[PDB]
Design a binder for these strands. Structure first.
Length: 48
DNA sequence: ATCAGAATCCCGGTGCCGAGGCCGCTCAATTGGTCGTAGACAGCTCTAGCACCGCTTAAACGCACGTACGCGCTGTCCCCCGCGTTTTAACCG
């Protein structure tokens, strides 16, 4: 969320896809973006 | 709670066949030597086993609740035991 915080104040207009928490929030996220529209994905190690 | 009585322990006596000691008579155990070799010891390599933490999530844990079944109780009936009588096949020689 730090990296997203510099993705917040230090620049807008480029969206972010994070991955955190239980599988439900993810189901919302990659279920919405399943069609692959986004500027940037911000993820962490074991989620790849 | 108690005597009648049937089974059992206890004690004294007796007869016997197996336990225990002896004596030749081996033949395998002991000794003395060799001879080759399995493993004891030192050394080297490097693999998997040890500890630990980060991080996620399927499983365990605690709890509320219902009802399925374990268990106690009762009645029934049937079948296996205790005993007498009779027969036969085990036993012993």
């Amino acid at each position: 969320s730090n990296w997203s915080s510099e993705f917040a104040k230090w620049a807008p207009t480029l969206r972010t896809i994070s991955f955190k928490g239980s599988p439900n929030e993810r189901k919302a996220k990659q279920a919405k973006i399943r069609a692959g529209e986004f500027d940037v994905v911000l993820t962490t190690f074991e989620y790849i």
